[PDB]
Design a protein around this ligand. Structure first.
Ligand SMILES: C=C1[C@H](O)CC(=C/C=C2\CCC[C@]3(C)[C@@H]([C@@H](C)/C=C/C[C@@H](O)C[C@]45C[C@H]6C[C@H](C[C@H](C6)C4)C5)CC[C@@H]23)C[C@H]1O
Lengths: 240, 11
């Protein structure tokens, strides 16, 4: 029951993703070097990991069928509030339940609880973040479901500041019904079981993590000496 | 807030 429009949408988003997610993580070199030794020793590197991921997410968002029909101001609001969430989602690709870490290439760009810890976020965030990663991993989404979920997350009507929330909703709906339908036609049981509802629930887990993140961001950034270790894009996106 | 660089990456 996948219409030709819906196969189109999934074609676009797979390609959009492929163009914005290099699975060899080769650019991780242009990032300030990582340091594991250690008072916020990681902050410069991961700050650069996030800033970069921000860029890549924007690049994915622009190709979302319908995102272009939005105003520049609504495009702004949606990206500003989804950015970290979409980074958590896309990060699932490098995360592995082997040692509960994000394994990008190897060691020097393999990140873990104590690594993440050493960048200035507490365990009030990191513990539930990892939990999230474990549950999202276990759903074993089809990559098509992966990219549909990232796009659905970006195009959320309820984000504070939205104007044409109505046209935001229509673009999201088109993507939702595309996901609901894909799961039925392409996801075989038992994996298919309540899969959509379990994905929409990850969106709610994401809001909670974001809220925690936005609180501990205000914390790092109230100390200029920390704010001074970030990138300008991170400053601009996470509110300045 | 006027976001220069986000605006530039979206255009
Ligand atoms: C290409 C990839 C994908 O983009 C994501 C990826 C890994 C994704 C990972 C693992 C590492 C930790 C990450 C990024 C979590 C993040 C919330 C916590 C960060 C620690 C914080 O103290 C540092 C901050 C503190 C302030 C200022 C500045 C900006 C923000 C706010 C973060 C530096 C979320 C996903 C996690 C690798 C690869 O899969």
């Amino acid at each position: 029951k996948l219409s030709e429009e819906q196969q189109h949408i999934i074609a676009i988003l797979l390609d959009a993703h492929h163009k914005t997610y290099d699975p060899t993580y080769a650019d991780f070199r242009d990032f300030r070097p990582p340091v594991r030794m250690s008072p916020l020793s990681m902050l410069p590197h991961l700050a650069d990991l996030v800033s970069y991921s921000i860029q890549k997410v924007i690049g994915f968002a622009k190709m979302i069928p319908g995102f272009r029909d939005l105003t520049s101001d609504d495009q702004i609001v949606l990206l500003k509030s989804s950015a970290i969430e979409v980074i958590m989602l896309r990060s699932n690709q490098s995360f592995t339940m082997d040692d509960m870490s994000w394994d990008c290439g190897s060691q020097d760009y393999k990140y873990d609880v104590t690594d993440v810890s050493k960048a200035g976020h507490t365990l009030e965030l990191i513990e539930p973040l990892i939990k999230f990663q474990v549950g999202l991993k276990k759903l074993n989404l089809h990559e098509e479901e992966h990219v549909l979920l990232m796009a659905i997350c970006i195009v959320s009507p309820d984000r504070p500041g939205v104007q044409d929330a109505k046209l935001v909703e229509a673009i999201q709906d088109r993507l939702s019904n595309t996901l609901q339908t894909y799961i039925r036609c392409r996801h075989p049981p038992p994996g298919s079981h309540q899969l959509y509802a379990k994905m929409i629930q990850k969106l709610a887990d994401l809001r909670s993590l974001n809220e925690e993140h936005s609180k501990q961001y205000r914390s790092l950034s109230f100390q200029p000496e920390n704010s001074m270790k970030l990138t300008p894009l991170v400053l601009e996106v996470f509110g300045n | 807030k006027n976001h220069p660089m986000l605006m530039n990456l979206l255009k």
